[PDB]
Design a protein around this ligand. Sequence first.
Ligand SMILES: [Mg+2]
Ligand SMILES: [Mg+2]
Ligand SMILES: [Mg+2]
Ligand SMILES: [Mg+2]
Ligand SMILES: [Mg+2]
Ligand SMILES: [Mg+2]
Ligand SMILES: [Mg+2]
Ligand SMILES: [Mg+2]
Ligand SMILES: [Mg+2]
Ligand SMILES: [Mg+2]
Ligand SMILES: [Mg+2]
Ligand SMILES: [Mg+2]
Ligand SMILES: [Mg+2]
Lengths: 258, 184, 223, 142
Amino acid sequence: ARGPKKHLKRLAAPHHWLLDKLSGCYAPRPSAGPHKLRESLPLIVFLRNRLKYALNGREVKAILMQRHVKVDGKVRTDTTYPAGFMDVITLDATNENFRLVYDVKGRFAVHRITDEEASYKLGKVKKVQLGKKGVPYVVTHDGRTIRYPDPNIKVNDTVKIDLASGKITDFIKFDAGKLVYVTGGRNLGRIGTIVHKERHDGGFDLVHIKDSLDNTFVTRLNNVFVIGEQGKPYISLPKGKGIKLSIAEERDRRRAQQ
Amino acid sequence: GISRDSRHKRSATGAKRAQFRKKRKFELGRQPANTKIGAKRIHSVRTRGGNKKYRALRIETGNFSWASEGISKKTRIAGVVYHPSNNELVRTNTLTKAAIVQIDATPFRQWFEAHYGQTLGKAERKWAARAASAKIESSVESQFSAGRLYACISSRPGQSGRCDGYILEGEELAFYLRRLTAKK
Amino acid sequence: MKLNISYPVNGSQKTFEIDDEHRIRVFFDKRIGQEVDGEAVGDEFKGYVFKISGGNDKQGFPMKQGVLLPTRIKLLLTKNVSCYRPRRDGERKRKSVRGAIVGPDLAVLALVIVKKGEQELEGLTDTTVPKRLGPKRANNIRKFFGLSKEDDVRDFVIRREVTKGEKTYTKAPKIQRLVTPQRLQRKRHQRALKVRNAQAQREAAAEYAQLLAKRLSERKAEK
Amino acid sequence: ELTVQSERAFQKQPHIFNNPKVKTSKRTKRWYKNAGLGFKTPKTAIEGSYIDKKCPFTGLVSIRGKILTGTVVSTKMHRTIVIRRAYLHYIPKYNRYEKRHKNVPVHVSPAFRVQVGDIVTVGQCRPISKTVRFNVVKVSAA
RNA sequence: UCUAAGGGUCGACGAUCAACUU
RNA sequence: GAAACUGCGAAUGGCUCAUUAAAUCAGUUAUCGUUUAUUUGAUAGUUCCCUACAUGGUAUAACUGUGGUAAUUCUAGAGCUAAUACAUGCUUAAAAUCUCAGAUGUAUUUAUUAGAUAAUGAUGAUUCAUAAUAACUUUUCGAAUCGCAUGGCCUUGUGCUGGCGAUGGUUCAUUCAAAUUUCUGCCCUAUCAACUUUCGAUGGUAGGAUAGUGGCCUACCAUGGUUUCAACGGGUAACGGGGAAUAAGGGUUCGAUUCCGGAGAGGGAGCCUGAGAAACGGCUACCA
Ligand SMILES: [Mg+2]
Ligand SMILES: [Mg+2]
Ligand SMILES: [Mg+2]
Ligand SMILES: [Mg+2]
Ligand SMILES: [Mg+2]
Ligand SMILES: [Mg+2]
Ligand SMILES: [Mg+2]
Ligand SMILES: [Mg+2]
Ligand SMILES: [Mg+2]
Ligand SMILES: [Mg+2]
Ligand SMILES: [Mg+2]
Ligand SMILES: [Mg+2]
Ligand SMILES: [Mg+2]
């Protein structure tokens, strides 16, 4: 339609932002950036709707323009910067670090982490390719390219990114028995261990995940994120650890506070 | 202007498609370069994405590869002797991909004499190292007597501004010689 | 008919009212830059050679440099031409401009005095206007004031005293392309950045080559 | 293929150079590929003399989309066939189906021999003509 | 000023010969 | 801090539903068929046949001054002056390998080579990534840019170094996109049964053109392609869908209209700028 759009109408925004229906006609359209549009979380949404630190976009911009907020070690004074999965949002004033992880409901949960863990981040290897001059590189889920990766690092692996030098300290390989985060689809936000991987050459790789409750669910390879080994995640999991309780037991737990 | 859309160009059932969507810029075509020979004239075309194409009009010289020894000398194009798509391109000497042209062959002769020292067209032991595997072909070597080598244009002059190509050899040269002595 | 006559040397311009056809026929049939003589046009001018450069006709349409017509025509005008200012990037407009050939249509001609023949005009040499602004670029000031390259032009830039509240503070231009320690520091920083990046890439490549050799040797030792 | 060099232009695989200086063995160096998805490269494609830049094994096309099956109903075009794809369309109101068909023009390589009938498997390729978007990959001549 | 198609004879090709119509 | 030059934006938004019936659209595919400003990440020691302690006006706007026309966001002549505008042009290693001292960065174009493997990366798959060889180029890039802090060494000099940034920039990747695209699915009508094909209709070869695939166009060639499983034609007071009303169940009717997709800016056509428009609060022409 003659060019790229710049507005995001309300009721067209991603549902996991949990934006009010009647606050306005428009939602914050995420700027171009690391992760995505629908799979992202703008800094304005994170600061005004999740933390309630700001009351409107004007206060969000006032907070940003004094270099307080910081995404993956960089200031990111952009109001609609597309913060996404595994991104570390550190506030130096009121020093606290958040890791953008999905709760089991598929929303970006408010997840406090320590400084020693905000030092790094995890990135799913989107591709492995030889660059110019024959220099191999890996492309991660958040748009990072890291030169000279370990030759055993393949697609669907996970790499730990130093986030200060932007280098790979360690890497987890995709195979059965590894802890995985689900980053899309129906099972978004669930955590389990890889059981099996169906190939379907030419189609879409499928992977079966078994959570701690022995519940098994299938999902595409595009939305599984290796986050460590069974019972030992490389990142701190959110409050619920992605267990996917049914509505009945959720109501039981809610009523368990009498 | 020229349009590459399929909204015209009636469907496979033969039905005439009703018109919507007045011509779009992202489906435009442009005029052929119709490259000629001599007095190099390259016009830049601003293409989609801010990129640049080069309409070569009146090309004089091109880079032609022997491809049997890997030489790729720059040489003058004499004229067009054959074109598989249109005899009018041969008649008008239109430079175009896959056109069979004649090239000066002087740079290739000079390289051959400086490489093998083997009287092609009529520090020391490099020529001796270049052993009895120095005969090229009885049909390529005979063209050096007239000083004109048959070559095929491999670049697209209207797209890239260059008239590069390769010297015909083997079965390709035999095929094009058959066509040339049949139609001439 | 009016004559917008200008003397570029030291600056001057004034408008004459030449209402006599007998004394104005000399400008006819001459397009641009011809040897129209002051003694040929009027008695006030003696020995003046006019550079006949432009004009406006009745209805105010300007003359275009190379139309070569006695009348006015509509031209599709572009960015870098006369008689049109594009209000938008890439905009072109079809505007009616008048030809270059001078004729009875013109309401005002514009003349440039290129040669001085006889007694001065009352708006030619007695009145002169100074150059409003001095040079800004450092080498431009050096060329204007005639000094050499290594002469440290930082002091005698043309200044101006503004007397508004009896403070009379000088106003000198910020001169550009100055050789400054800040600029030298920027250049040094750029060279250092390039060399540091090259060294970092070289050592990363060396470490990766070491890694590859280690893995290959391990594989061949594992058979 | 019956004087393969039957066009005005010399027919050859691009960038597959038969060096006349070397006295090689086969003397007709031929490029072929495994099309993928378990489709076997036919021996005709392996050892033939046709060029067919649109062949899924010896040409410049790739099979990357939908894999369809059809019944050949026309072999009257040059290196192109029409396959009839019969299917049942569900009409919910009557809880029943109706027979429907769609004709798909498919490019057929000289590696395959195809006649009317001859249920074939076709794979999606890039547009290679106005109407053709599929290439025969398995002949299954029955 | 050209281009293309349409033949005879003789030994999937070669040699030779030939007239017009598009 | 006016004005103006420069940069970016003005291609978003908003409006409307006229066209449009395999078209749009919906779900589902593909790009191993392409372009992509911007964002984010990475990325550039190679530039020469007497400036770099930094080049030019080949430049001018704003401004000064003189005007024309009744009238326009019309502008003319003359006199100045800047750049992250325009046009130029150096400094930054060592080593190795080829050629017979020169060359080897990157971008472009061509050709050739490697890209392996049951007993030297990736993909289901490639002529992929990438590298190499020989050349090629109306030379692409390889900062002559800006702010703030001022530091270390020291021959104490216009000394040599040096921080945090901003902007600009080649390529790759990413993101926002775009363009095509697979499969299936549209209401009534036979008082529409044949339709398309000279003037492209279906396919092949080659070329041109495109950002790229493709009869998209051209040349030559073949005679194909759709259809009673409704083609083609005609009608729509038809933009499609999410949905709305009514609804035991099944259905029937509606959906211009708060979201998504498309299309258009009186009707047409053409085009400049730009990453992106066949733009209309942009231009050009014709019609009214
Ligand atoms: Mg809009
Ligand atoms: Mg390649
Ligand atoms: Mg083609
Ligand atoms: Mg409707
Ligand atoms: Mg309507
Ligand atoms: Mg509607
Ligand atoms: Mg209506
Ligand atoms: Mg709408
Ligand atoms: Mg429009
Ligand atoms: Mg109206
Ligand atoms: Mg328009
Ligand atoms: Mg309006
Ligand atoms: Mg508008």
